């Protein structure tokens, strides 16, 4: 059978945390938690997170001004982040799941966590990690990923 949704949830924690670290470095305050990963960065899921941050670099830089402006208006903090994350992610996936949208969610998690840290003065990366993992679990994305062979599929389209 396919890998479990539970395995994908574990994998997602590693892909996200690796993605956040490597995305921050190529955009070069870093939240110090970002240097703590679930597993070594050379693990398979560590490598996937790194590659996804690389692949997205140019696209992300093109939307930076827009996104910064939008987050300045929303003012995410620890007190509203779950509501804002939930509403935004649900709208992202309303029409269906695809890889680009799944990777975009990692980028949203990055931006949300960095904003709450830089502007809201609160380290929130572990919490955003859980939001991302749990959203994928509960919205069929972990299962969709598992049925395509896991996160490695994103690099092999």
């Amino acid at each position: 059978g396919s890998m479990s949704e539970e395995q994908v949830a574990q994998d997602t924690e590693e892909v996200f945390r690796s993605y956040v670290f490597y995305r921050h470095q190529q955009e070069q305050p870093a939240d110090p938690e970002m240097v703590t990963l679930p597993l070594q960065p050379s693990s398979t899921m560590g490598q996937v997170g790194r590659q996804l941050a690389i692949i997205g670099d140019d696209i992300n830089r093109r939307y930076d001004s827009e996104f910064q402006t939008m987050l300045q208006h929303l003012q995410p903090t620890a007190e509203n982040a779950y509501e804002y994350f939930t509403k935004i992610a649900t709208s992202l996936f309303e029409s269906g799941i695809n890889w680009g949208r799944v990777v975009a969610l990692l980028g949203f998690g990055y931006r949300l966590a960095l904003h709450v840290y830089q502007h809201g003065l609160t380290g929130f990366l572990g919490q955003v990690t859980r939001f991302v993992v749990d959203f994928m679990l509960h919205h069929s994305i972990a299962r969709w990923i598992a049925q395509r062979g896991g996160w490695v599929a994103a690099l092999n389209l």
Partner: peptide
């Protein structure tokens, strides 16, 4: 309200572009 849906629209646009880059 209004800003949340605009972030979602921006992420959908990013998603489309990432789909193209991954393929």
């Amino acid at each position: 309200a209004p800003y949340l849906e605009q972030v979602a629209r921006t992420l959908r646009k990013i998603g489309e572009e990432i789909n193209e880059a991954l393929r």
